Amino acid sequence: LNPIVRKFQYGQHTVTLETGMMARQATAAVMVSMDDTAVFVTVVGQKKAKPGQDFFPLTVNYQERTYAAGRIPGSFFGRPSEGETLIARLIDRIRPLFPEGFVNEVQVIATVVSVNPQVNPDIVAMIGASAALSLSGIPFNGPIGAARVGYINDQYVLNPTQDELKESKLDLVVAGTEAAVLMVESEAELLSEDQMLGAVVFGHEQQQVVIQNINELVKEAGKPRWDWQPEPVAYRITDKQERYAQVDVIKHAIEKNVVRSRVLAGEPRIDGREKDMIRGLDVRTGVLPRTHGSALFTRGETQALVTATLGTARDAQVLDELMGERTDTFLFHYNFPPYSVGETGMVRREIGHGRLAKRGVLAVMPDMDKFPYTVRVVSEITESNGSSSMASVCGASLALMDAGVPIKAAVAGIAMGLVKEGDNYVVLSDILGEDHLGDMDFKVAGSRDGISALQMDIKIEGITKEIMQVALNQAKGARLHILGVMEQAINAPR
Amino acid sequence: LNPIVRKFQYGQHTVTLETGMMARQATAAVMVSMDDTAVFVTVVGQKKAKPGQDFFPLTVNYQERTYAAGRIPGSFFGRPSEGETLIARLIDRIRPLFPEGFVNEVQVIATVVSVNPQVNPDIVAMIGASAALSLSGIPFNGPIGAARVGYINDQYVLNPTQDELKESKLDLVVAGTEAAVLMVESEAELLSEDQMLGAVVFGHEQQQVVIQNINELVKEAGKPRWDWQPEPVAYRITDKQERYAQVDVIKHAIEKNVVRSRVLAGEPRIDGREKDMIRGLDVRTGVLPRTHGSALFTRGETQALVTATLGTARDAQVLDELMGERTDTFLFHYNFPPYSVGETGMVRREIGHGRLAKRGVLAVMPDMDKFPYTVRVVSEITESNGSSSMASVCGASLALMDAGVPIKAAVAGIAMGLVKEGDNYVVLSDILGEDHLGDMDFKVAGSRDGISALQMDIKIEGITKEIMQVALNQAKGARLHILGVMEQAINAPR
Amino acid sequence: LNPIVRKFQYGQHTVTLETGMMARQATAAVMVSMDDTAVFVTVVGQKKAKPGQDFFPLTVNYQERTYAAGRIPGSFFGRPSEGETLIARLIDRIRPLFPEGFVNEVQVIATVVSVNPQVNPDIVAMIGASAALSLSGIPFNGPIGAARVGYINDQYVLNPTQDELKESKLDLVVAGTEAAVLMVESEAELLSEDQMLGAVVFGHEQQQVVIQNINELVKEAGKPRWDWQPEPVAYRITDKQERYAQVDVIKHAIEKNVVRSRVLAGEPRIDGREKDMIRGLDVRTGVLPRTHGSALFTRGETQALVTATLGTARDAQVLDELMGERTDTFLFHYNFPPYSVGETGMVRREIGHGRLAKRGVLAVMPDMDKFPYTVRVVSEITESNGSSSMASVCGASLALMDAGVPIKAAVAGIAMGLVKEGDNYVVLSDILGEDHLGDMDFKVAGSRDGISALQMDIKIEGITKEIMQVALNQAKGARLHILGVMEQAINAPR
C-alpha cells in the first residue's frame, strides 16, 4: 500500500491531503485533516447512466461519528440530525460545476472520524469533497475552496476558532472556484453592505491556497479524465396557479430564453412589474387567539403564518453536538405543506429555509440578561411563490413583537435575482418561483441599520464585485420598503 | 386581501367560518374557530386523474401544533401520534359522499393552530373539512355537520366540555348530511338501546345549524362547480380461504348484485346461514403459561388471542396531549398480522380497531379505588373474517377475568350489516368480510345490562330510526347469545 | 375446533408441538412450548409466483412481546430491535432447503407469546419454524433440528439454562437436517479445534429427537404436498473492480461451473493464488489523532478502519431484554457503506457481521475487576472483497491495544471456503467475494491458543467430520499467519 500525502498552511492551521491508501474501490477517497480535525470523504460515480434519465442525481451524505471526540454514543443517536443535513447542504450547494448534460448518478459521502473542538469539521468536509471530485476523473469544473470569515476588532479573520467566534460579529461561509464565487452563507450582527461584500471577496482570495494544493495533488495522483462528451445540438399570465395549469402543452429551454430576453431588453416581467418593484404587502398581527405571539405576513402570492411561544429557562433545547454541549435558547421551526403550491403529497429543504430565517432573526434577538426566557418561533408557509424563507423573517419579527419580546429593532428579508449575458445585467427585486431561469439568486435579511443574514447562489462565470455592489444596494432599498409597511401595523412589543 | 367571515351559534359556543385570505393556492382553505379553538383546514384536488387509476385516493392529515396551547415542543414529538390518526379517521369516515366514478386524487390537511382546553378540536376540524370540500367545487354531496352528544342527569347535552364530560355517561360523536346520518362513534356507561339511538337522532338534529351556515358561505364565496361527469353505462363456498382462491377468474359489480339479491329475497347466505344466525363459538381460558391473564376467542373464521398484564401505578402511560396532561391506567393494544387473512406483507387500521375494542371494555373496567393497578390488554388477531375488533372485546373480557381483574360484568361485541333497496330490508347478524357488499355496517359492544360502545358507518340515503330500532334489537339478542356461551367457560375472576 | 398436541423430551425439558387450532387461514401455524417458553410460529406461501420473478423471496420475522414475561411495555419499544433481527437471522440461515427453481413468496412469522427466564426462546422459535414449513406442504427438504451446546466441566451440555451458561465456556448454536449440518453459530473462551468440532457433532446428534417428532406430526396432521415441479433442463482478472466492470456481457450457471472446475482440478484461483494462500497484509496503528484507540487493517482488497473508546461504568448500555435486565460493558458497532464495493445507495447484515466480530473479540476482553471501564469498538468497512467481519476482528484487536485496553492476547479472524463434488475436495483460505460459487463457507476467529468464534454455513449433502477436521486445521494455520504479521506492528497495550 502507498499513501500520497500533501500538506499546506491554510491560514493558521495545517491542512493534510491524503489519498491512495483508504477506500480504493470508490472512484476517489480523500483523508483531509486540519489540526486534528479529520473528515474522510469518498465519491462514487456510476459509469453508465439509466437509459432516459431526466435529471442529474446528486446525493451528499454528511455524518458525524461520536468516537471522533473520544466519546461513546448514548442510548440516543439511523436518520441524520438537523445539523448534519445543513452541512451536507453546504457541500452540495459543487452541484452547478457538473457540465450541462451530465446525468450519471454520483454520491459523495463525508464522515467525521476525528475532531478538534476548536476546528469546525464543516470546512474540512468541503475541502475533502472538492479534493475527491477532482481526483476522481468525473467531469467536474473545480476544484473549489472553502473559507470561514470572521469579523473581530473591525478586521476580517480567516477560519476563526469556536473561542474566537464568540468575539466575532460575523459567521460567514464562502465557497467558490479560482475564477468566481459560487456559494455564500452568512450570519451577522447588523453589519453594513460593504462589510458583508468585503468578507465575500476576502474569503474567496484566502481560499485560493486550497485550490492550488488540490490541483497539484491532481497532477500527481489524479485518475485519468472521464471519456464523456455532451450530446451535440403565457405573457399576461400573472397568477401562478392560472399560469402553471394552462402552460401544460401536449405537443423548457425555450421557456427560459423567452423570459430571459424579455428582462434583458427591459420590458414588463412575467407578472407585469419593473425590475425594482415589490409585490403587494399585507401585514396582520394578533391573528390567533390562544397563542402568545402571532403574525400573518403576505407578499403577493407568498404567505407565512408565524407564531411565538414564551417558556422558562428549563424549556431550552440542550443539543449534544460533536464539538461540545450546547444550550439553545432561541428555537426556530419551518413547515412547508404541499398545499402552499397547490399540490398533494407528504406532509422539502425545511431545515435549510428554517436556519436561514433563524439567522435573519438571531442578530436582533435580545440578551439573556435583559430577557431570560426561552423563545420559540414557528413559521407555517400557507402560500409559496418566491422565497418563503424571507417571508418567515418578516413574520417572525411581527410575532415576537406581538408576544412581547423586546427585540432590538424590526427585521425584514428580500429575495433578489440576476440576469446577465454581456456587460448589460439586470438585478430583480422580489423574484417569483424567475428563480430557475436565472444566473444567480441571493437573499438579504436585516434591519434598518444593518444586515443580519446573507445567502448567495451563483452559477455563472464572471460576476464582478461592482455588480454585487449595485445588487446589494437595490436589496437595501427593498427591505427598507418592507420595514416601512411593517412599521405601521406593529411598531412596539407588549 | 379580503377575508370572508361568517359567525353562528353552535350550541353554547360561537363558531367562526373564515375563508379567502389564507392559503389561496389550494382549492379551498377554511379557518374555523370555536371559542378560541381554531383549526386551519385545507383541501387540494388534482384536475387530471392518473390514466387508468383503479381506486379513489383520499388522504386526511390531522396534526396538532403544541404552540396552540402556548407551549414549546419538547425533545420529543415526523410521524403522527396515536390520537392524531384517530381524529384523522373521524374526519375521513366524507368518503362515501364523493360520486361513484370520481377517481381524482384529493388531500385534506387539518392543523390545530389555536386551542381552548375546554373545547375539543376534533369537532372543529370536522366542520372545517366539511366547509373546505363544499367551498372547493370538487364533486361532493355535502356539507356534513359535526356533533358531540353527552348524557348528564338523564338529558342529552350538545358539545359537552372536558369538565362536563366527567359527569357524562356518554361520549358520542355523530356526523351526517341534512338527509341522513353517515358516521357514529360512541362511548357509553352501559346505556340502553333507545338511549344510544336517541343520542344519534338528537345529534343529527342539532348539527343542522352547521350545514345551513356552510351552505350560505358556499353561495356567497364558493368557487364554481367542477366540470366533471361520470362515464355513462361460488354458492356453496363457505370457507373463506377456499372461496377466494377459486373465485379468481381469468375472463365486482356483478359479484355484489348476486349476493345482494340472494339476501333480499330471503335465501341462505354465502356461508349458508339465516339472517340472524351467529357462527360457531369456541371459548378458551388460561392458554399461555407465563402470563397473568390469557384468553382465546374463536368465532367461525375470526380468532383473537388476548392477554392481560398487571402493573403498579407507576407503570401507567403518561400521555402529554394538547388539551392537557393525561394519565392512562387502562392500556389497549391491537395487532393485525398478514397471516390472519392468509397473506404475506408488512408486520392496518390497528389504531381504529384498538380504540373501538378499548371503548367496548372501558365501561366495565373497575375503579382505581377498588383496583389501584395499571392493567394492559393486548389482542393478537390470528384469524380474520368479519370484525376482529368485536372479537377483541370478547377476548379482553375473558383475559381480564383470567388475570383476576374484578370487572363489573362480562362484555361482548357483535358486527351487524344491512341490505336495503325498497321498503324491504334485512339486518344481518355476525357478518363475513358481506361487509363490502352492503349499505351500512355497525358494531355493538356491551354487557347483559347495557351498551358500552356503538360504531356506525352508513352509505345509503333514507335510513329511518325505526329501521335502526329493529337493527339494534337483533344486535342485543346477538351479544346476549355470545355472553351466554362466554358465561360458561369463565364466570368469575381470580 | 380440534387441537393436535404432541409432546416429547428434548434434553432436560419437555417440548410441546401444537397445531390445527390457531391461525388456520395461514398455510401452517404451530404453537411450540418448551417449559413455559412458548413461541407461536406461522408460515404463508403464495400459490402463484409473480411472472418473471428473478430471485427467491424469503422473509423471517421474529418479534418479542413483553407481556410474555408478565410486564407492560414502557414509553419505549414499530421497527424490530438488534437482538430480534439476529434471532430472525438464526432462523433464516432453512433457506438452502427450498428446491432450486422455487421462486414463490414465503413469509415466516415467529412471535414470543410466553417466556421462561431460564429457557431461551431462540431455539424454541427455530423448532417452530421447522415444524411450520414441514406441516405447510410447501416444497421444503426438512425438517431441521435446533440445539444449543454448552461446555461445563469439560463436558458438553445440551440446552444450558441462563444460570448454567454462566459456568459454560461455550455458547454454540447448531441447526441441521437428519443427514447433514447446515448452520453453526458459536461463542467460545479460547477452545481448541477438536472441542469446537466435537460440539457441532454432539449438537447434531442430540437434535435428532426434534426432527423425528416433527415428522410424526407431519404424518398425522400435515397438509398434502404441493403440486410443484422444477422447469426441466475473466481468467487473469485479479482486481475485483476491473473484473466486475468488464464481465458485463450484453449477449451465471456457467460462471459458477468454470470457477468450480478450475479449483477442483488444482490450478490458480481467480486472482491467482494457491488453495492455502493469504492475500497481502497491511497493518497500521494510531491512524486517527483525536481518538483513544485506532487501527487500519488491510487484507488484499478488504479494509477496515477500527476505533476504540474508553468510558466510565455509567456509560454502559442498559439493555432491557425479554429474558431479563442486562448491562452491556463491551459495545461493538459495524458500518457497511456503499463505497466499500464501489456502489451508490443508502448509507446490510451489519447487525449479523457486527455480532460475529463482537463474539470473536469478547473472549479476549479483560475482566471488570482488572479493567472497570466501558469499552466501545466501531468498525468502518472502507473496502470489501471477502469477509469484512473477520477483518473487523483483526482491526478491533489492534485498536484495543492502541487504546490501552489490556486484552488477554491478540486475536484474528479468517474466512474459509470449500468446493466438493466427489471424494475430492479443496478447502480455500481467505476467499474472495468465490463465496457465492461454493458448497460451504465458514469463518474462524481466535487467538494463538484457542478459538473465540466459529460460524458455519453449509448447503451441500454429505460433509464428513474428517473433512471439517482438515478444514479447521488449515484455518488454524491461516490465523496464526495473520497474528504473526499483527504481532510486529502492535504487540503490547498502553
Author numbering:
A (entry chain A), B (entry chain A), C (entry chain A): 2 to 78, 82 to 97, 99 to 238, 257 to 274, 298 to 393, 398 to 483, 485 to 545
From the paper:
One widely occurring ribonuclease with such multi-functional versatility is polynucleotide phosphorylase, a phosphorolytic exoribonuclease (PNPase; polyribonucleotide nucleotidyltransferase; EC 2.7.7.8).5,6 PNPase processively cleaves single-stranded RNA substrates in the 3′-to-5′ direction using inorganic phosphate to attack the phosphoester linkage at the 3′ terminus and liberate nucleoside diphosphate. E. coli PNPase core forms a homotrimer with a ring-like architecture that encloses a large central channel. The two RNase PH-like domains within each protomer are spatially related by a pseudo-dyad axis, so that the PNPase trimer has approximate dihedral symmetry D3. In the current study, we solved several crystal structures of E. coli PNPase core bound to its cognate RNase E micro-domain, including a complex with O2′-methyl-modified RNA bound and another with manganese in the active site.
The RNase E micro-domain is also well resolved in the rhombohedral crystal form with Mn2+ but was poorly resolved in the second rhombohedral form grown in the absence of the metal. In the RNA-free form, however, the helical domain is partially disordered, which suggests that it is highly dynamic and may potentially become more structurally defined upon substrate binding. In comparing the RNA-free structures of the PNPase core, we observe that the FFRR loop is dynamic, as we find that it constricts the pore in one apo form, but it is disordered in a second crystal form. We observe also that RNA binding at the aperture requires two channel-loops and may pre-organise one of those to engage another RNA base as the oligonucleotide is translocated along the pore. It is likely that the S1 and KH domains may also affect the conformational adjustments, since a comparison of the structures of full-length E. coli PNPase and PNPase core in the RNA-free forms shows that the central aperture is expanded in the latter.
